[PDB]
DNA sequence: CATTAGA
DNA sequence: TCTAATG
């Protein structure tokens, strides 16, 4: 957590690189397990050699460890850090809709900047054009104070369209968080569960509402169960307009709501932790259900859930307010 | 880890 | 169809 920290940081820097700038999925996967294992190790690694006794720790890596232990640096790391191409990749990647593959290609063509990207909108797809368009706004945090005004509008049209819907704004927002990155709305309907052959409209209806009123301004991607867009709080009585925000709305079989909701509410650790416990408590949890364990090794059969509580009950735990679902 | 765009 | 990008 801190005794092996530099090594873990150097290492991830190393990996992240192979992965993006190069297409070394392997080296990349290598750096990570190592970074991973060196991270658990209970003592201060004093040399490659010592490191080396580890699993995943090759001669290539141990070598890196000495140079880093020896001198507080690493050339390779220094060289990469300097590398204009590699840097360019790292950058274009911040555009929404540009992932490594497009970054490389773009650089290849000589588009290494925001401005480059502009001159060439034509070389970009709708998602990328949008991500381009709101490069700033998308990088900006979402103050809870706004999170509350957005949730508010959302639940209102939801309800307007059909009173039968149930929406929940998940994430750190739901767990308290002073600010968030984007909003995550989990949606559901009774008239939609596991079997009941969809109702694509179910999703459409609402997206259409939100738009109708200018809450939704763009569409990054609209499917029949997952809509990914951009929204904006009505810019008041002037002098202050609001930054464009990313929003994701997703349909869900009413019979799977609470688990999904449970889950997406995190935290990553609270989850993992609760989950680890359901195992002891003779269960299995995951994004959609909760199944009882059968001694033979495994088992099936989804227990029925009507609330975040059912799940709790089941593993015989203390209901934890989202607020304190931190870990 | 599953859903969407796209070519 | 595959492959990329998001979350
Ligand atoms: K080893
Ligand atoms: K990106």
Q: Which residue is nearest to nucleotide C3 (CA to C1')?
A: A101
Q: Which residues precede a break in chain A, with C-to-N distance above 2.5 Å?
A: none
CB atoms within 10 A of CB A297: 6
What is the gyration radius of the CA atoms in chain A, in angstroms? Answer: 24
β-strand partners of A186: A168, A250
Q: What was the structure determination method?
A: X-ray
Q: Which nucleotides of B are covered by protein (CB under 7 A)?
A: 3-7
A90 C-alpha to center of ligand 2: Å? 9
Query: Two tokens at A75?
Result: 């050339």
User: Whole-number Å distance, CA A53 to C1' C3?
Assistant: 38
3-state secondary structure A65-81: HHHHHHCCCCHHHHHHH
Strand C contacted by A21 CB (< 7 A) = no
A243/A225 Cα distance (integer angstroms): 26
A275 is in an annotated binding site: no
Centroid of chain to Cα A146? 20
Nucleotide nearest to A227 (CA to C1'): B4
Give chain A residues 257-296 with Cβ within 7 A of strand C.
Answer: none
User: Whole-number Å distance, CA A99 to C1' C6?
Assistant: 10
* Burial group, residue A181, by CB count within 10 angstroms (0-12, 13-18, 19+): middle
Nucleotide nearest to A126 (CA to C1'): B5
Strand B contacted by A82 CB (< 7 A) = no
A83 C-alpha to center of ligand 2: Å? 20
A53 C-alpha to center of ligand 1: Å? 5
A169/A150 Cα distance (integer angstroms): 10
Note the resolution in Å, 1 decimal: 2.7
Containing H/E element for A229? strand A226-231
User: Whole-number Å distance, CA A158 to C1' B1?
Assistant: 28
A93 C-alpha to center of ligand 2: Å? 4
End-to-end CA distance of chain A: 17
A251 is in an annotated binding site: no
A248 is in an annotated binding site: yes
Query: Two tokens at A194?
Result: 């596991």
Q: Which residues of A are tagged catalytic?
A: 64
Q: Are strands A245-250 and A183-188 parallel, antiparallel or unpaired?
A: parallel
Crossing angle of helices A59-70 and A5-20, in 10° steps, is: 130
Q: Which domains does chain A have, with CATH numbers?
A: 1-83 (1.10.150.110), 84-140 (1.10.150.20), 141-263 (3.30.460.10), 264-326 (3.30.210.10)
Strand B contacted by A221 CB (< 7 A) = yes
To 5 degrees, how large is the angle CA A235–CA A238–CA A243? 35
β-strand partners of A226: A250
């Amino acid at each position: 957590e801190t005794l092996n920290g530099g090594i873990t940081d150097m290492l991830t820097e190393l990996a992240n690189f192979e992965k993006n700038v190069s297409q070394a999925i392997h080296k990349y996967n290598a750096y990570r397990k190592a970074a991973s294992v060196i991270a658990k190790y209970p003592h201060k690694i004093k040399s490659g050699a010592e490191a080396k006794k580890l699993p995943g720790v090759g001669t290539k890596i141990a070598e890196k460890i000495d140079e880093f232990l020896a001198t507080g640096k690493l050339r390779k790391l220094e060289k990469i850090r300097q590398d204009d191409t590699s840097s360019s990749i790292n950058f274009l990647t911040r555009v929404s809709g540009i992932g490594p593959s497009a970054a490389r290609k773009f650089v290849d063509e000589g588009i290494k900047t925001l401005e480059d990207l502009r001159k060439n909108e034509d070389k970009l797809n709708h998602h990328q054009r949008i991500g381009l368009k709101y490069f700033g706004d998308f990088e900006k945090r979402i103050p809870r104070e706004e999170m509350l005004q957005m949730q508010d509008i959302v639940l209102n049209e939801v309800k307007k369209v059909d009173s039968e819907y149930i929406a929940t704004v998940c994430g750190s927002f739901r767990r308290g968080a002073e600010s968030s990155g984007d909003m995550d709305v989990l949606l559901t309907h009774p008239s939609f569960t596991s079997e009941s052959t969809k109702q694509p409209k179910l999703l459409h209806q609402v997206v259409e509402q939100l738009q109708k009123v200018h809450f939704i301004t763009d569409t990054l991607s609209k499917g029949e169960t997952k809509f990914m867009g951009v929204c904006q709080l009505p810019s008041k009585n002037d002098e202050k307009e609001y930054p464009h925000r990313r929003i994701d709305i997703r349909l869900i079989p009413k019979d799977q709501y609470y688990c999904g909701v449970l889950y997406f509410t995190g935290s990553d650790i609270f989850n993992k932790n609760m989950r680890a416990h359901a195992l002891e408590k003779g269960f299995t949890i995951n994004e959609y259900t909760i199944r009882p364990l059968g001694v033979t090794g495994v088992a099936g059969e989804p227990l029925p859930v009507d609330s975040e509580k059912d799940i709790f009950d089941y593993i015989q735990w203390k209901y934890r307010e989202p607020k304190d679902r931190s870990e």
